[PDB]
């Protein structure tokens, strides 16, 4: 009960900032997640024995892929932690519990391939889940791990609170399907602008939590330029592997995914910042003003990609 996780001074201070990098020491990442749960939720939210067993089973079920790996899971959970801490009174006890777990689990058992590649391959998962293919798999994997003996971190919730938190986690993980982000944000934009946005309306909260999930999932674009630039290499390593597998199916990949067309990456990054990232953090900043630093950091990185294109780096 009286056992707190503490971090070294530099981490204890920087972990509170949106642009925190969790570092190259993998063995510190579980401790960083428990620290965030304890400050975001309470030291009582989870039995520490069960939480530690849950974390380590989640870690084991992430693969050794360049980007969609255990470091991504903890990075996305940290961004959610920073949003929740800067918006203290907007979220319920159940939501703070559910969303940190949702972020840690959101890419469980990812193979480094898009929903599109699974469908063109004719992967069994594409027959089981016709849309949000990987995301329905990630939620399925989450439920499987929660049902391992000694892994049910929610066991002390009432029956209805248990059902509520599993439903928060399901919607949160489905929302990480970028195909669903475009319509979700358009609707949030209209609701904000016509002044109909109402956070006591459950359908409205769902939408806002979905946008938070997109914002945390993309948070690699909100780091200091050296982190953003080095993470983009990991992202493109999966894209080019997927491109290679498209060529093996006799399909020319989009140029972004073709490792023979690396010169076109910086222009591809600009489209992504302008079509996805900037609009995502703009709507997020409008709805939750204290998340402005994510939008500012994203604009700074857009400007760094413009310099890469102009040949200034
Ligand atoms: C963090 N992110 C994810 C992502 C980046 N760039 C992308 C492009 Cl060009 C197309 C489709 C994507 O899902 C992405 C990136 O840096
Ligand atoms: Mg995903
Ligand atoms: Zn992700």
Curated annotation (Swiss-Prot):
Residues 1-312 form the PDEase domain. Changing residue 107 to A: Loss of activity and of zinc binding. It comes from the Eukaryota. The active site is at 68 (proton donor). It is found in: Cytoplasm, Cytosol. 3',5'-cyclic GMP binds at residues 68, 269. A divalent metal cation 1 binds at residues 72, 106-107, 217. A divalent metal cation 2 binds at residue 107. Abundant in the putamen and caudate nucleus regions of brain and testis, moderately expressed in the thyroid gland, pituitary gland, thalamus and cerebellum. Plays a role in signal transduction by regulating the intracellular concentration of cyclic nucleotides. Can hydrolyze both cAMP and cGMP, but has higher affinity for cAMP and is more efficient with cAMP as substrate. May play a critical role in regulating cAMP and cGMP levels in the striatum, a region of the brain that contributes to the control of movement and cognition. This is cAMP and cAMP-inhibited cGMP 3',5'-cyclic phosphodiesterase 10A. It comes from Homo sapiens (Human). The lineage of its organism: Eukaryota, Metazoa, Chordata, Craniata, Vertebrata.
